[PDB]
Amino acid sequence: YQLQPLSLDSVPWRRQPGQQVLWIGCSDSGCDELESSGLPADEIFEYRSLGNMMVDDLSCKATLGYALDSLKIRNIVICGHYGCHIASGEVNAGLQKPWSSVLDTLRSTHRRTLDSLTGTERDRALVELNVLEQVHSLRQSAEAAEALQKQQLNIWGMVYDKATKRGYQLI
Amino acid sequence: YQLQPLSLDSVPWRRQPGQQVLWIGCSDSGCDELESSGLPADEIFEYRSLGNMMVDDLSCKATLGYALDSLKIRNIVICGHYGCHIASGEVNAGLQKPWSSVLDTLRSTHRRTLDSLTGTERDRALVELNVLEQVHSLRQSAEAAEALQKQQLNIWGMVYDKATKRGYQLI
Ligand SMILES: [Zn+2]
Ligand SMILES: [Zn+2]
Ligand SMILES: [Zn+2]
C-alpha cells in the first residue's frame, strides 16, 4: 500500500451525490475525523467500534446487512486514526478477543517491517496495517463478496491525522 | 418518565472534568447530537450502533468491558434521537434479530400507549421507550449491577431533538 492525501472535492466514495456511505470508525476517535471525509452529514451512516474493526459477530453482520439491504449503500469506508490507543504497541488487558487476536496476528504477520521502527512510527504503521486488514477481511464477508461480484460495492481504507486535520487514502 | 431539557454546563454525566464517558448513540444520528452532550471531544468514548442498542453480543460486551476495565469509565449515556429510521413505525425486514426483537417487544409491551398517538408522535414515543429499555437492560447486566451497587457507575438516558438542537434527559 501507499498513502495518498485526499482532495475533499473528489473522494473515491463520493463520485455522485445523494447516496449513503457506511463509515466504520474507532470509539476513541472524535467527530473531527468526518470533517476530512468529503461527505455531508446526511450521506453518513456511522458504525463506531473498538479499533475501527469488524469482527464476525452479530453486530458486524446486522450492521452490514441493514446498510446493504435497507439503505442500499454502495460504498464502505474503514477510517483508522493516528494516536489510536487500541491499534497500537500498548497491549491493554481490558481488550477482549477477538479484537486482541486481530492485533496479535498483525504484530506477528508484519514482524519484519514493525521490528525496524521505534514507538511512534511503529504505532502509525500498525494503524495503517489494521485499516488494510479490515478492508481485506470485510471483502471476504458473505454479504460483501456477493455485492462486489455484482460490482455494487466498494470498500475503501483511510487514515485520519488529528494533528494535521488531514485524511490519507490507502492505495 | 418525564423529559427534562439539559443545561450544557450542568450535565449529570459530567459533575467533574477529566474522566471519559461511554456514549452509546445511533448509526443514523449525526455528530450534531454530541454538541448537546456537554462534553469536550477528549472525554467521549463513542459506541455508535443500530438504534443506540446494546444487545448481548460480543461487540456490546467487549465495548462495555474495555470502557469499565481499561478506561475506568464511571458514566454511560444512551442517546436516542427523534426521526430515527430504526426505532420507528413497525417491521423493517432488513433489521435482524435481536434488534428487531427488542423493537417488536417494545411495540407489544407498550401497545396501549402507542395506540393513543398518531404516526409521528408514535415514532417519538418509540425512540423514548427504546432509550428507557436500553438503560434498564444495561443496568441488569452482571458487570453493570456490581458497579452500580458500589456507586462506581451511572447509566443515563437522553433523547436528542435535531429541530430544537437540544437534548432531553429521561427522568
Ligand atoms: Zn482508535
Ligand atoms: Zn461524530
Ligand atoms: Zn437512529
Side-chain angles (χ1 to χ4, degrees):
Chain A
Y1 70 93
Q2 293 177 335
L3 294 175
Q4 202 96 290
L6 290 156
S7 332
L8 54 33
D9 50 330
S10 27
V11 296
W13 43 89
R14 191 189 197 252
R15 301 305 190 183
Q16 180 87 55
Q19 280 55 40
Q20 276 185 298
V21 173
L22 167 60
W23 190 281
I24 301 167
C26 186
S27 289
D28 68 23
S29 179
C31 303
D32 273 344
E33 157 181 310
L34 289 186
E35 297 173 350
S36 88
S37 71
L39 294 162
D42 229 26
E43 291 181 7
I44 301 167
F45 189 74
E46 183 180 3
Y47 187 66
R48 197 165 289 280
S49 58
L50 301 174
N52 45 269
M53 294 190 191
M54 301 283 267
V55 300
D56 72 332
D57 71 348
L58 292 194
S59 294
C60 155
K61 297 155 197 202
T63 305
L64 191 47
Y66 175 83
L68 297 176
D69 299 332
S70 175
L71 306 184
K72 299 143 187 212
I73 293 186
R74 290 218 190 175
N75 289 285
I76 301 175
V77 182
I78 296 170
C79 190
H81 67 118
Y82 296 128
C84 181
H85 301 295
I86 294 160
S88 80
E90 91 193 326
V91 176
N92 182 91
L95 186 65
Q96 289 167 27
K97 299 181 181 200
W99 295 266
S100 63
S101 303
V102 173
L103 288 170
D104 184 1
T105 291
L106 278 177
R107 286 185 280 251
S108 60
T109 185
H110 303 284
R111 257 172 63 190
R112 291 182 183 177
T113 65
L114 293 181
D115 290 330
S116 72
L117 305 170
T118 65
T120 171
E121 282 303 305
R122 184 165 62 98
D123 283 350
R124 291 175 88 82
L126 197 65
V127 169
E128 295 162 2
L129 290 169
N130 181 53
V131 174
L132 177 63
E133 172 55 38
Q134 297 302 315
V135 170
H136 289 7
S137 97
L138 199 60
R139 290 196 186 123
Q140 301 187 308
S141 79
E143 293 177 350
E146 68 160 342
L148 282 164
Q149 293 177 335
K150 293 179 179 179
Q151 201 176 309
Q152 282 179 357
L153 182 68
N154 289 286
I155 308 179
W156 312 99
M158 71 158 277
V159 185
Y160 177 67
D161 195 333
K162 178 185 181 184
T164 60
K165 299 195 179 146
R166 292 172 80 201
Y168 302 86
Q169 186 197 357
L170 285 186
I171 300 181
Chain B
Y1 69 92
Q2 55 192 185
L3 294 179
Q4 202 99 292
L6 293 158
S7 335
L8 274 55
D9 64 342
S10 45
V11 294
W13 48 87
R14 189 187 197 246
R15 299 306 191 181
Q16 57 184 71
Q19 280 58 38
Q20 257 168 298
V21 172
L22 167 58
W23 190 280
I24 301 169
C26 185
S27 295
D28 70 23
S29 180
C31 312
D32 273 340
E33 161 179 310
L34 286 190
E35 302 178 334
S36 94
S37 71
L39 295 162
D42 68 336
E43 292 182 11
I44 302 170
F45 188 74
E46 182 182 9
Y47 183 66
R48 193 168 292 281
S49 61
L50 293 183
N52 45 271
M53 292 190 198
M54 300 284 269
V55 299
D56 73 331
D57 183 35
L58 295 183
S59 292
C60 302
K61 293 180 192 294
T63 303
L64 183 57
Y66 177 81
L68 298 179
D69 300 330
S70 175
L71 303 185
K72 296 169 182 166
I73 292 185
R74 283 222 192 156
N75 288 287
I76 301 169
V77 181
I78 302 174
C79 188
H81 65 120
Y82 295 130
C84 178
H85 296 293
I86 295 158
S88 85
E90 326 229 283
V91 292
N92 185 329
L95 185 163
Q96 287 159 35
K97 298 180 202 195
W99 295 266
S100 63
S101 306
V102 175
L103 287 172
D104 289 340
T105 288
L106 282 177
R107 286 188 284 245
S108 61
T109 183
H110 305 285
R111 257 178 60 195
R112 292 156 173 175
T113 302
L114 300 176
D115 281 11
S116 63
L117 304 167
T118 61
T120 93
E121 284 304 305
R122 186 185 318 262
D123 282 350
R124 291 174 82 83
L126 193 66
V127 169
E128 296 166 6
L129 289 171
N130 183 48
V131 170
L132 285 171
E133 182 51 32
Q134 293 302 316
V135 168
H136 167 83
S137 101
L138 202 55
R139 284 185 186 143
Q140 300 205 282
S141 77
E143 214 176 4
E146 178 225 347
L148 285 166
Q149 190 172 327
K150 293 179 179 179
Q151 199 171 315
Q152 287 182 343
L153 183 63
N154 289 285
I155 309 182
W156 311 102
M158 72 158 277
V159 184
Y160 176 67
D161 195 334
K162 65 174 85 174
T164 58
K165 299 187 169 172
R166 289 180 183 181
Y168 302 89
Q169 184 188 353
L170 282 190
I171 304 169

